[PDB]
Structures are given as structure tokens and as C-alpha cells.
Amino acid sequence: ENTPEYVSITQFKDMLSRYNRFKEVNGREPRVVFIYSGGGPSVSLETFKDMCKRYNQFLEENRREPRIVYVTPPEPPVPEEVREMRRVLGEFKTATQLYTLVSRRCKYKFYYNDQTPNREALKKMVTDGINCTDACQLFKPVIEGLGYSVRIEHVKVRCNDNKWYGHYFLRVAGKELASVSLPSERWTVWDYVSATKTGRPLGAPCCSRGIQHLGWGIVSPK
Amino acid sequence: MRSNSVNIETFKDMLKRYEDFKMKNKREPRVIFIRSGGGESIPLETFRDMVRRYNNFKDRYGREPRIVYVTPPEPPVPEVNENTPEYVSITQFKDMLSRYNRFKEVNGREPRVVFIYSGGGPSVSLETFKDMCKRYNQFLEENRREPRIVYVTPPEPPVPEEVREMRRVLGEFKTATQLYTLVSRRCKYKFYYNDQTPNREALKKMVTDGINCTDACQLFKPVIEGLGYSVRIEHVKVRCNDNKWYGHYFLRVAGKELASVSLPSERWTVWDYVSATKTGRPLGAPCCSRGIQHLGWGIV
């Protein structure tokens, strides 16, 4: 039985009931939460917390409950994301080839906003430019679809004005890049801003005067 | 008492014998002896942490450390801004598998969850990871190469569009009971072994030629979920044949006016497209009445 991509709101509330029953009897959180009464597929506690977050977000934004609660974040099909990228930039099979094509064709532009519809950002990418958050969210699925491990790192970097800037880039491992056995903070830097703005090579952050780790993943403001 | 640290020469010697053991026995040793002919050993996961700190030190200072501390591995750290993903790359899946196998080897049991990344962050349940491994193995069989990605949760059709497309064929409906009734007066059943078909064409075949039980289950599951119910596809056997049993798929449905969701799913309401469209049996009854047994959950 495939672990489900989403479950009914009915099922989600039943999971919450079983979660609370376990806490009631045992005085602590369960490590996993079974999707259905009686056993079978289960999600980790981390994943269940993600599910509650999505329910909360939907309820806040829409003032009603969702019918459907996603177990993992909805995404367009990976082969399409890769094919659309290839349509724009040409053929590529490695993260190093992709970086080279990006460096020759894509542009960087700062803008807060964060809305990254792939088709939309694909066009802005080669015209006005995109920011590093849209860049990271556009390129992570393509590079994963080539077979690489990718993790979005939130950092502070110090630039040639000697000022610190918050910044996101990709940490990439697998194939020709860093060994996935390394800690993620030692994977290869794949930085859309190095490629399109500051002209630094694959492996180098966009600014060279200092780097500090802030966190993993993109902070979604609430 | 256990040693709290070793000097760099001792550590390089342990690392040498560790690598030799690996090449010789094709697995990591569960303990690493501080001296080759020696009593005291360091457990594998402590030793792997020693190596990691050693490599981090060289990477930072461009020189080897004078001392390597012996410290048991630490708890994971959470990552609230990372979600458990829909899929992982083959690179990450094989790293997950490498850590799952080492956990078994070291601890003699399976872990309850498997972290996507080493060190903490999002994780999948043991159950989900076993399902990932099975579908990975199946891909290796059908094709003759490793996949480039491995789904944590295989994609399911987006629900609002499925409901919209079904409503364009059957008209408005709001409950699973009402939908069954509409289906029983409009849709048609056709026996065929076409493993899937569900695109728009399936909805057209529904009301003209007919569809089979697997297409019907894959079509009506997301629609009924879209109406507010939980749905699980059951693989069963039902006594009709020549008169010696047939294999069959139907929907188990819970929520709203149908079965209590807190029941185990094999007590949920039977929603059988074949009952509605061919054998004329009511909602809650399988298509045949001498009715046989449970085979599994989901489309085989």
C-alpha cells in the first residue's frame, strides 16, 4: 500500500484523536502516527507536525477547513520541471552543466514577493531576473530530478561593501559534486547569485568576506 | 575506564584498520580496537563521529588535530523550516538506506523513523521507508537501472480538478450516497484488463462503453475524498467465478453519513462501482453476495 500523498480532513482529525489518546495514556508524543485506525501506513511525528501546519495555514488563509490535508507538500511532476528548464536553457544532464547554462543566460533581481509559479519564474529568469528564494525553489527540484541531493541553506554572507546580507543558496551532493556522506554544511555550494550576478564559480558563495549558517530550508513568514 | 581521547597517531592507526576491515569484510566493523592487539574498542558510531570531527578540523585549520576526543553520538536536531518531501533523489535515498543498514547492524533492530538527512531534520516512518525500498526495488526490476528519484509518497491526482471533471459528467452532487445513486442510473461497467487508463477518456467511457473496477476505483477515490470522506481501495476476492472466486477492487469509505472513521478500514462502508452499475446491489454491498476475502490495500 502506497503511503498516501494526502488524506481526507476526516482522516486527519482521526489521526489527531489517536495522537492525543497516545499522549493521554503515555504522557508523551508518539514517534510515528498511524494514518488509519487498525494500523498500516504511518507518518513520522515530524511529518505529522508538517500536516498540522498545512491545516493551520489553509484555515488562516481561507477562513474554512480544507477537504484534503497533504502528507507531503504538493509539487508539479519532476520530469515536467526538468523538461521545462531544458526547453529554456537547453540540454543539460549534470549540476555543473546547469550552473554553466544559468551563468550564461539567467539574471538576478531582488524583490521580497516570493511567488514562484515555475512558468512565470522561468520567463522572468531570462529577462528581468529572479531573487534567491525563487531561484532556490526553482532549481532544487530540477537538480534533484537529475539525481543530486539538494538542501536549501539559509546563511549570512559578507560582501565587498563589508555589510552582511541574509541569503539562501543550494547545498548539493551526489555524482560529480560533494560526497553525500559529508555533513550537509560541507556539500557543494550551488549559488544562483554567484552564477548570474557576482561571477563566482560553482562551489563559491556569492560573496567572499564571510559566511555564517542561520538554518536549513526557507523561512516562510507567518 | 574508557579512554576519553586518543592521540593523532593512534587515531590514524584505528582509521587504517577500519578501512582495511571494510575492504576485507565488505562491511563496517561494529567496534574499532584502539590497538590492533588490544582490549579496549570504540563503538562504530562513536568512531564515525571521531572521523567527522577530525575531517571538520582539517577542513577548518588545514592541519591535523593533536587529539581526537571519544564522545558518543548526539541526539538529532529538529528542522522546522524543512518539510518531509514528496520525493528524494537517488543520491539521498541511498544515503538514507546506508544509515538504515548501519542502524540495524549496530543496534540489532530497525529504527522507528529514518531521517532524510543525516543529523536530524525531517524523517519518514519505518513503514514509509520500507514502502520506498519496495518501490525502488520494483523500479530496478521493471527497468534495469536505478531511478533518479524515489517518491516518499507516490503522487495522487489533485482533488479539486477531479471533482470538477466528475461534476461535468454527472452533474452536481454533495454526498457519497447521492453520488452512488447517480452512478447507478448513469454509468456503465465493462470488464477489461487495462492496468489503468484514468485520463479524461475514462470519464467518457464511463457513460458510453463502460469502465472496469480498477479504473472506477482510481476515478472515484479522489472524487469522494473531495466530498469530505476518507477512502481506502481494498483488493478482495468475491465468491463468483465459474463458481470458484474472482478478484476484485472496491472502495471503503468513512465519514459524514457513511461509516465511522475510527473503525478499522475493513469495517468501513463498501462503495462498489460494480454493484451500482452491473449487479444492481445497494450501497454498502459488494458486487457479489457469496462474498469472499481480503487480499490487500491499494491497486496491485
Curated annotation (Swiss-Prot), chain A:
Further comment found in the protein's record: PsiM2 is a defective prophage of methanothermobacter marbuggensis.
Name this polypeptide is given: Pseudomurein endoisopeptidase
Entry GO MF terms: peptidase activity
Coverage span on the entire protein: 82 to 303 of 305
Record has Protease as a keyword: yes
Keyword field contains Ubl conjugation: no
Location of the active site: C132, H167, D191
Record text about domains: The N-terminus contains a cell wall binding domain. The endoisopeptidase domain is at the C-terminus.
Biological processes annotated in GO: defense response to bacterium; killing of cells of another organism; proteolysis
Family to which this protein belongs: Belongs to the Psimunavirus Pseudomurein endoisopeptidase family.
Cofactors, names only: Ca(2+)
Temperature-dependent activity: Optimum temperature is 71 degrees Celsius.
pH influence on activity: Optimum pH is 6.4.
UniProt cofactor note: Activated by Ca(2+).
Keywords in alphabetical order: Antimicrobial, Bacteriolytic enzyme, Cytolysis, Host cell lysis by virus, Hydrolase, Protease, Viral release from host cell
Region spans: Pseudomurein-binding repeat: 6-35, 40-71
Species for this entry: Methanobacterium phage psiM2 (PsiM2)
Function recorded in the entry: Cysteine protease that cleaves the cell wall of its host methanogen under hydrogen limitation of the latter (autolysis). Cleaves the epsilon-Ala-Lys isopeptide bond in the oligopeptides of pseudomurein.
Known EC number: 3.4.22.-
Residue ranges crossing the lipid bilayer per the database entry: none
Subunit structure and binding partners: Monomer.
Top-level division of the source organism's lineage: Viruses
